[PDB]
């Protein structure tokens, strides 16, 4: 089905403790494949997936240089943003950037992305048209004016429509063994008596990929959307993910509850029940 590639970046100033830290990672869908950390002994972009290891010296050098140039630019922007926001240089601030593309089953571009955030808040984002911008405030508007005059949107659009999707397909072909394989969740239901009057029914989903998944509990066929405890999908550490949903049920009414599981790795949605 559909696939995506994303490059995440984070720059964090630490006044009195050296230059801003820089960390960038790249993903194809939910698979991490490259990383760069300015605090590493000898900073360089490193592979984090077996299918990217084959790329030659030129690739790695270019990538490393890009990362370094980005880190430098973020440092200049953190200083600029202090002015834009009339802030002292004594505090720590954050600059985040994400960009990438989504392509459909046929390998064509579905959508492009390029958005920044300052101290956790939306700053400036390229619109889905890949030609206009959205500034979250008057400070961001200053950046918008500089980028419009310099025609940044055109450059980004050319990358997003060309290189981005071109390399994504290349990665997908090279790592097809993993990037194009869905691991369905292994599921089961646990029951934990809380007291004589009620008990916990927990629906588990383990070792699945990609992360996208839906878990829901129904009482007499009705979604318990407001009475379900759902934990954040979490990484198992081996590329797969885990997640669970729980409901506090009245003792004796356990069989009125069904857990429903949806995941691209399953031919049909699953429905589970607790076996007393």
């Amino acid at each position: 089905g559909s696939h995506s590639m994303r490059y995440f970046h984070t720059s964090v100033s630490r006044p009195g403790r050296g230059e801003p830290r820089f960390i960038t990672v790249g993903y194809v869908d939910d698979t991490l494949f490259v990383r760069f950390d300015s605090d590493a002994a000898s900073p360089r972009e490193e592979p984090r997936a077996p299918w990217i290891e084959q790329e030659g010296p030129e690739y790695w050098d270019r990538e490393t240089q890009i990362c370094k140039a980005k880190a430098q630019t973020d440092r200049e922007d953190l200083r600029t943003l202090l002015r834009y926001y009339n802030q002292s240089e004594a505090g720590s601030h954050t600059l985040q950037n994400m960009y990438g593309c989504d392509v459909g089953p046929d390998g064509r571009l579905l959508r492009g992305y390029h958005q920044d955030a300052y101290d956790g808040k939306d700053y400036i984002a390229l619109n889905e048209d890949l030609s206009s911008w959205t500034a979250a405030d008057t400070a961001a508007q200053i950046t918008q004016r500089k980028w419009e005059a310099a025609r940044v949107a055109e450059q980004l659009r050319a990358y997003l429509e060309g290189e981005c999707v071109e390399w994504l397909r290349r990665y997908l072909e090279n790592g097809k063994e993993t990037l194009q394989r869905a691991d369905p969740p292994k599921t089961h239901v646990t029951h934990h008596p809380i007291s004589d009057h009620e008990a916990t029914l927990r629906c588990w989903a383990l070792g699945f990929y990609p992360a996208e998944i839906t878990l829901t509990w129904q009482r007499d066929g009705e979604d318990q959307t407001q009475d379900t405890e759902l934990v954040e999908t979490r990484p198992a550490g081996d590329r797969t993910f885990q997640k669970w949903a729980a409901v506090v049920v009245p003792s004796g009414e356990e069989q009125r509850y069904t857990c429903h599981v949806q995941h691209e790795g399953l031919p049909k949605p699953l429905t589970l029940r607790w076996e007393p």
Binding site: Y7, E63, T73, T80, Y99, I124, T143, K146, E163, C164
Partner: peptide, 9 residues
């Protein structure tokens, strides 16, 4: 593969 172009805010 990453985007190059260096442009400050």
């Amino acid at each position: 593969s990453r985007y190059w172009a260096i442009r400050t805010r």
